[PDB]
Amino acid sequence: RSRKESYSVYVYKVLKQVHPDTGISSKAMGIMNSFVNDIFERIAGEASRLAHYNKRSTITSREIQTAVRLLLPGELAKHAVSEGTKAVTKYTSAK
Amino acid sequence: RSRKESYSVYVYKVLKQVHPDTGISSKAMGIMNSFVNDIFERIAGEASRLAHYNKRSTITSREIQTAVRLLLPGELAKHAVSEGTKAVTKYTSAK
Amino acid sequence: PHRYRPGTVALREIRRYQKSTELLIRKLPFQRLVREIAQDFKTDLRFQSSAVMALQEACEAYLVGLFEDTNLCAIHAKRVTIMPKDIQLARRIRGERA
Amino acid sequence: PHRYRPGTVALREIRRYQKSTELLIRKLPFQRLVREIAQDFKTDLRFQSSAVMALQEACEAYLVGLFEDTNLCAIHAKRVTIMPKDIQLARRIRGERA
Amino acid sequence: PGARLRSGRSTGAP
Amino acid sequence: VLRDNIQGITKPAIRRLARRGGVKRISGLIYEETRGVLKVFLENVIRDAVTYTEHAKRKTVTAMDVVYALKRQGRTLYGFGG
Amino acid sequence: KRHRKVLRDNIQGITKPAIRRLARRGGVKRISGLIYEETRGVLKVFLENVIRDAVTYTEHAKRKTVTAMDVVYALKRQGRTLYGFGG
Amino acid sequence: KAKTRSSRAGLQFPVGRVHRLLRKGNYSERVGAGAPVYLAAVLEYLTAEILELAGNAARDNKKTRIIPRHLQLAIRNDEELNKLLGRVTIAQGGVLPNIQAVLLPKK
Amino acid sequence: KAKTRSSRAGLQFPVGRVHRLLRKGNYSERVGAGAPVYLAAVLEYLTAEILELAGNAARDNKKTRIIPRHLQLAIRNDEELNKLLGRVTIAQGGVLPNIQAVLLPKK
DNA sequence: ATCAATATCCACCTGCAGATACTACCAAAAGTGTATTTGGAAACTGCTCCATCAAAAGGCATGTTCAGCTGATTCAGCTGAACATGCCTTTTGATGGAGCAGTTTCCAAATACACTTTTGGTAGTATCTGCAGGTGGATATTGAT
DNA sequence: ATCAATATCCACCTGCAGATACTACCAAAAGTGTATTTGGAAACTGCTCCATCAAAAGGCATGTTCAGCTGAATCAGCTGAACATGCCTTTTGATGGAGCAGTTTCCAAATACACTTTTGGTAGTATCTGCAGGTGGATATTGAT
Ligand SMILES: [Mg+2]
């Protein structure tokens, strides 16, 4: 009877922004969880290595961006980099 | 002249233990150095992951041991597990 | 008395099974085979339901991938019939042995 | 004047290059190719000489590997001459391409 | 002004 | 009427797998060769999985034991955790 | 200053003979004449992928020099781990 | 008085959770303020991209509920997602319809 | 009475160094006393195995000094080291002599 | 062509498995306020990378020549695809208990600190020596005949 | 099965390049040996969900008939190997110039940490409905003729 966290709530918000009339099966949602956890580990992983390679204690937005450049193909990178630069912009301008 | 460290000194010790009249080129030694750092990372990495998978915050000889079983093939694992189990039990009962 | 020619039902199976996602091995024979192979690593072992499904999913996906690469190796030798030497070449170039 | 039959010097060369470890591409051409490709990604780059030698070591090991898989592909098709379609199949099975 | 996909669709507005 | 568990992986099943893979024609030798490959796959994965199980001092192999094993064997599976 | 001499067409420095030699190490006995241009294509794609990741490491380090470590880290990433040049 | 780091950053994805998962994950001693904002944006983008194309696929099969089959079709029909997930098995996804041309009957 | 943990454990390989690299590499919050000793011993075992076989390749080729070719011959001629290092390039190794049978002449 | 057998396709229907929606409870995110750690900014090294050039082996390009490989053709025999049945195995649905996991408790083990001591790196120096590269000369391999 | 052209082998014989091996030497790291923290093995227990086991159901084993695929034999066209010839470019080994990595010292931001306040996200639950079947009847496909 203990808390089993997931990304379901967020996957479901993003689904409703993108396909407001569209639902998602339990199995599909399991695949989207696996997805987010995977890309999480891949990105955090490369960031960690990048930080270690430059003798740094700290993983900043910059290590996340370089990681994303190394890990995402062609146009996915370019769009991910701008969504990520944007969210950091919008957050730095929030009193 | 910043002290850039390696496993050379130890590699050379072990060379003399097994082939006492045998030398090693600095390239060959370069390879042995890469070999040690690589296996080090692979084992440490499996171990790090093993501990996270089990909600532990400590890498013990137990985690190294399982890592060796996952990473090394059959016989190399058997012997590596021996030399490790021996080295520890001895280190422990040498205090 | 009407009989379909060799390779006409084959194409039809291809179109049917490429359209579906159902597992294509029977559960119980697969479950038995897992438990056998496992027994030889640790005895008196229990398996979560999902744990066996995860294996079957993985194992079927693997073999289907392998049949695709195999098929390309048969077609490369100017045949349409997969043979052991196809499966063996696919595995060799994928780095699964030799 | 006495000729070796086609194949005899080829086998002589295989024996010779398989015995040795020397890089097989000229140093300077390869360095220009590295500087050209790098330059098109970023201007004003320099290279540690070792960085280039590492690239050359990594490229020759890759191409030699790929020719072994390519030759298996030619031999599977009952030829002894490698052709593009052999390289293409090797890379498709290595999953270096779709 | 939310997430913009490769297709060119957006995530609504505010 | 008793037989090996591996032969439980029947000709018609292996035929269905091949068909998903777009295979038209199948030599009779394939069926034993496929069983061969299958066994090795399951050997490699179940070994690592059970090694997870033993490390967690459990007597039950979990989905995660398998997902973690599939991930290190280069066969990452989505939909069963992780 | 001097600015650098223009680099063009360097892929053709990978001569037919150099490609024969590599094939021979790989155990090849006979080579179609189309193999040379196919190998150049494959080599360019390999070097572009390694160098793009090397140079990303160089840029993240805020250096202007690509090090052997940059290359070694790129190779490791690409699953072509190289021994003999550090790390 | 309290306003989620997510709501400040413009994101559905939890900036707080991503920060904690970066801590409890032994990636580094320290974690920049922005790093979890960026990471959460990237994960949201990629989630949008996949739910976009999966949505499209679901609609096409005259369907309003995304299933794994729809995920597999979106991914394996996108050069870029297919590369990013080249070594990944979507359970219950099947494959793309693909018959090698030479396997088609003659007439 | 300063003993190194190497000597306590009966190892050439440095247990201190290995303890520290496990520390600075952010593998985990904390590192047990056993872990560095075990790991240094496994690294020492494996480097002994490779030097045994490369030593033999050196002697077979009528040489006193192990070069990278000797390490490549050792590793590639050993089923288990070959698997351990199957995605690894040994600079200046070369390859094993190996000609496919069909390529050899005559009947 | 025709003609029929079977497969395939689309509209409509409908029961419930598997979604979406709703609520209270608390773990874990956010807020505030000191407590440490860092990662540029400036300012110098020497390291090492660019460049340029001269002389000479060493490999590249190109054209000629023909051995033998590839791939098109033909064809025979064997080997897989198809198919019609019932029985045997799997699938489905309904109970006992192994053991996972929840959780609290206390000590053996790991951290934190700041000492003292020793290792391992390097620069510098010399000091040695394995072997690459060369050169004959005796021996093996290949291909003509 | 003879012979000659030319490749290959192997044992000598050098001159270093690169290895080994001193130093002395020091600086950073490993070790020592209390002071402080705490993570995880221990023991208990509850309640999932796993193994087992007996009716419901379709999938598979089987043997026969032959369509058409594989692979064998043959042959000619022409591609790719060998090699001779001419010479361009790479290799090598200097010199000088400087760009830029790599250090080492102030710190003012930046992030960690310890504690408190707040609420978003989870787990029961409680409804709602997408769609997997099923049926009917039209049309397309395949293969006989
Ligand atoms: Mg250019």
Side-chain angles (χ1 to χ4, degrees):
Chain A
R1 291 180 254 92
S2 84
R3 315 230 125 139
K4 197 266 195 302
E5 285 177 339
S6 97
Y7 287 104
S8 311
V9 144
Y10 319 107
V11 173
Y12 207 102
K13 288 156 165 189
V14 178
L15 173 50
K16 285 317 185 179
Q17 321 195 254
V18 151
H19 279 295
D21 290 324
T22 299
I24 171 159
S25 84
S26 196
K27 275 181 179 75
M29 183 58 78
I31 286 161
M32 299 293 325
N33 258 297
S34 291
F35 177 57
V36 175
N37 283 310
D38 181 6
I39 306 305
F40 188 103
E41 291 166 350
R42 298 205 207 175
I43 292 177
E46 184 66 57
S48 185
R49 267 172 256 121
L50 274 170
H52 290 136
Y53 295 162
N54 297 290
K55 281 176 268 182
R56 300 276 189 278
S57 31
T58 319
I59 290 173
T60 72
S61 7
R62 207 164 160 273
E63 286 70 45
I64 297 303
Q65 166 161 121
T66 301
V68 160
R69 276 201 197 109
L70 286 169
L71 280 160
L72 305 196
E75 230 42 54
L76 246 31
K78 202 235 127 169
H79 272 246
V81 162
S82 101
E83 282 294 322
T85 296
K86 185 169 101 176
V88 161
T89 271
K90 225 181 202 299
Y91 172 90
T92 278
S93 289
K95 53 142 202 188
Chain B
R1 62 202 150 288
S2 188
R3 107 159 213 172
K4 43 170 167 147
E5 51 163 42
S6 90
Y7 293 96
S8 274
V9 127
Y10 323 109
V11 168
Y12 190 85
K13 272 175 196 192
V14 178
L15 177 56
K16 290 320 193 161
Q17 287 192 311
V18 306
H19 295 279
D21 302 314
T22 293
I24 189 169
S25 86
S26 79
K27 289 210 168 81
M29 182 62 73
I31 289 149
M32 290 312 305
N33 255 283
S34 296
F35 169 68
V36 171
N37 283 307
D38 182 20
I39 300 303
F40 176 96
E41 264 149 24
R42 295 209 224 167
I43 286 153
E46 264 302 339
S48 162
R49 250 179 270 127
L50 194 44
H52 285 137
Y53 297 166
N54 289 290
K55 307 164 200 278
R56 303 255 157 283
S57 58
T58 326
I59 287 171
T60 81
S61 30
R62 184 158 195 281
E63 281 76 45
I64 303 312
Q65 168 156 112
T66 300
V68 169
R69 281 210 186 98
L70 297 167
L71 258 148
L72 302 206
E75 281 313 283
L76 282 170
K78 272 198 196 299
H79 298 9
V81 164
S82 301
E83 288 254 50
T85 296
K86 171 143 147 277
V88 163
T89 306
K90 162 151 186 171
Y91 174 84
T92 321
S93 97
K95 231 299 165 55
Chain C
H2 194 267
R3 181 179 176 80
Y4 282 118
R5 300 233 278 246
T8 295
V9 176
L11 265 11
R12 224 146 63 207
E13 292 175 58
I14 292 167
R15 299 214 164 77
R16 160 180 164 202
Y17 289 117
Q18 284 194 341
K19 223 145 195 152
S20 57
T21 73
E22 5 71 305
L23 289 172
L24 299 179
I25 302 178
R26 319 285 306 289
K27 292 204 174 179
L28 177 62
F30 188 83
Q31 194 151 15
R32 286 202 301 263
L33 179 45
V34 168
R35 286 167 191 286
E36 176 180 327
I37 291 156
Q39 192 64 25
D40 303 3
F41 298 126
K42 209 205 181 166
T43 57
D44 196 27
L45 262 186
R46 309 173 106 233
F47 275 92
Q48 300 186 340
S49 129
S50 62
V52 181
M53 286 295 288
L55 274 173
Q56 208 192 317
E57 278 295 335
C59 174
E60 289 211 9
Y62 168 74
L63 287 179
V64 173
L66 190 61
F67 280 122
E68 302 167 22
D69 300 347
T70 304
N71 202 29
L72 290 172
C73 293
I75 291 160
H76 182 68
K78 299 193 164 193
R79 295 183 269 107
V80 303
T81 316
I82 66 167
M83 308 183 182
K85 67 164 111 142
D86 301 322
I87 301 189
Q88 277 155 22
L89 176 70
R91 298 199 54 248
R92 162 64 194 74
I93 293 161
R94 276 160 160 233
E96 290 174 23
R97 59 110 228 279
Chain D
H2 136 307
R3 303 210 116 218
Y4 295 112
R5 278 149 57 192
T8 295
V9 190
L11 289 159
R12 215 210 292 319
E13 285 168 7
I14 294 175
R15 278 171 235 292
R16 162 185 174 187
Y17 292 114
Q18 280 187 358
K19 189 174 161 185
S20 60
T21 76
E22 5 101 47
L23 296 175
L24 297 183
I25 293 170
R26 290 295 108 217
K27 247 199 230 305
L28 167 69
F30 181 83
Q31 193 165 66
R32 273 194 249 116
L33 179 52
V34 170
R35 287 177 189 292
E36 181 180 313
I37 293 167
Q39 178 164 68
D40 290 351
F41 280 116
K42 224 278 195 175
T43 57
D44 310 331
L45 283 174
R46 317 169 100 212
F47 284 86
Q48 289 190 343
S49 80
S50 58
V52 173
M53 290 314 298
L55 288 168
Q56 196 175 349
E57 280 291 343
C59 288
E60 299 205 14
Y62 164 84
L63 285 180
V64 168
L66 181 61
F67 282 130
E68 293 163 15
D69 298 4
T70 293
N71 209 38
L72 291 186
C73 285
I75 286 160
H76 183 71
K78 305 200 176 185
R79 293 182 274 98
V80 303
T81 314
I82 60 162
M83 339 207 305
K85 81 206 211 180
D86 300 315
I87 302 189
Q88 285 153 15
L89 174 69
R91 296 222 309 128
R92 162 57 188 81
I93 290 168
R94 289 170 155 218
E96 284 179 24
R97 56 157 299 163
Chain E
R4 159 143 272 78
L5 281 35
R6 290 171 298 166
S7 50
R9 99 143 45 190
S10 80
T11 53
Chain F
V1 203
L2 76 310
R3 71 178 193 277
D4 287 287
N5 286 312
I6 191 65
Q7 306 282 328
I9 309 302
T10 59
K11 166 152 174 162
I14 291 160
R15 169 163 285 247
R16 281 192 296 279
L17 284 171
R19 286 273 193 269
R20 189 160 280 168
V23 180
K24 193 184 197 186
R25 215 160 172 287
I26 307 178
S27 148
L29 302 168
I30 291 300
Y31 309 104
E32 267 306 296
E33 195 83 21
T34 303
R35 289 191 192 98
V37 171
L38 175 40
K39 210 163 146 285
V40 163
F41 183 92
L42 287 178
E43 274 165 10
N44 294 343
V45 172
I46 291 165
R47 181 184 294 123
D48 290 0
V50 159
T51 301
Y52 282 112
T53 322
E54 286 209 79
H55 186 88
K57 291 153 167 165
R58 289 188 272 91
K59 288 164 209 179
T60 310
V61 173
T62 55
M64 296 307 296
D65 285 348
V66 168
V67 172
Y68 286 145
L70 287 176
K71 174 134 76 219
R72 67 176 322 278
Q73 289 295 332
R75 312 294 314 168
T76 292
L77 188 69
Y78 280 9
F80 290 81
Chain G
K1 286 316 93 211
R2 58 263 305 118
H3 81 49
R4 275 134 172 173
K5 216 302 199 164
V6 173
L7 295 172
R8 24 208 284 269
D9 219 21
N10 278 293
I11 197 38
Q12 290 294 330
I14 319 303
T15 59
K16 162 168 176 227
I19 295 154
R20 272 171 106 66
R21 289 193 300 270
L22 288 163
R24 290 297 181 242
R25 196 152 284 173
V28 167
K29 185 180 182 221
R30 222 173 161 275
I31 297 161
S32 150
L34 298 173
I35 283 289
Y36 311 113
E37 267 309 311
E38 193 89 8
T39 311
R40 294 205 190 91
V42 170
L43 174 50
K44 185 167 152 293
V45 164
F46 177 90
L47 265 181
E48 285 170 355
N49 299 349
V50 176
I51 299 167
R52 189 201 298 105
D53 288 6
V55 168
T56 299
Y57 284 119
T58 307
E59 271 176 299
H60 179 99
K62 289 181 202 166
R63 295 179 265 99
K64 298 211 192 189
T65 309
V66 186
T67 53
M69 286 314 288
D70 284 344
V71 165
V72 164
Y73 289 131
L75 292 172
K76 204 177 289 264
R77 271 206 82 255
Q78 226 78 58
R80 314 281 321 161
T81 295
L82 178 59
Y83 287 7
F85 288 99
Chain H
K1 205 199 286 148
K3 229 66 234 298
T4 69
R5 278 200 280 180
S6 310
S7 65
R8 300 204 195 281
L11 300 174
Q12 319 295 313
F13 267 46
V15 175
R17 192 176 274 182
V18 166
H19 192 303
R20 178 204 100 214
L21 287 177
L22 284 170
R23 307 174 155 292
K24 262 103 208 184
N26 297 136
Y27 297 112
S28 56
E29 278 185 334
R30 332 177 96 241
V31 179
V37 181
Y38 207 119
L39 183 41
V42 166
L43 297 164
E44 196 181 304
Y45 165 59
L46 288 165
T47 295
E49 206 67 71
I50 283 160
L51 288 173
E52 160 71 313
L53 295 171
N56 297 352
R59 144 88 36 58
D60 297 353
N61 292 204
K62 286 273 215 158
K63 248 95 187 203
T64 66
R65 176 177 291 143
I66 286 166
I67 58 167
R69 175 51 161 194
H70 303 147
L71 290 177
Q72 168 78 329
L73 289 170
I75 286 166
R76 319 258 93 124
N77 282 301
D78 185 74
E79 182 196 310
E80 295 183 322
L81 287 171
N82 187 65
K83 190 186 150 209
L84 179 72
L85 299 188
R87 305 296 313 159
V88 154
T89 310
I90 296 189
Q92 275 304 300
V95 307
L96 296 199
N98 202 16
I99 307 181
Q100 295 303 306
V102 83
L103 298 181
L104 293 189
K106 297 284 92 76
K107 202 205 292 185
Chain I
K1 54 242 282 76
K3 283 280 150 55
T4 70
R5 296 199 273 161
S6 287
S7 50
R8 280 195 210 265
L11 297 181
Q12 308 306 304
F13 261 48
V15 173
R17 191 103 110 193
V18 168
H19 195 357
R20 178 196 95 217
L21 297 171
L22 279 175
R23 188 146 276 147
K24 100 203 290 184
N26 266 152
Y27 296 110
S28 63
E29 296 269 293
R30 319 165 98 246
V31 186
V37 174
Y38 202 117
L39 175 56
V42 170
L43 294 178
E44 186 183 299
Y45 167 53
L46 289 179
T47 124
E49 201 52 68
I50 288 169
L51 292 171
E52 183 62 30
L53 291 176
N56 294 332
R59 194 202 43 252
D60 289 326
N61 290 274
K62 256 124 212 203
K63 304 292 188 286
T64 266
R65 191 194 290 146
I66 292 169
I67 69 184
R69 162 122 284 208
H70 303 140
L71 294 169
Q72 167 72 346
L73 292 181
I75 291 170
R76 292 321 157 190
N77 279 304
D78 190 72
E79 198 194 287
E80 290 200 334
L81 280 177
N82 189 57
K83 186 172 195 165
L84 182 59
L85 297 179
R87 309 316 304 329
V88 165
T89 297
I90 282 156
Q92 278 298 302
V95 302
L96 295 195
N98 186 7
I99 311 186
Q100 296 300 307
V102 305
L103 295 180
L104 295 183
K106 100 207 168 188
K107 75 284 129 216

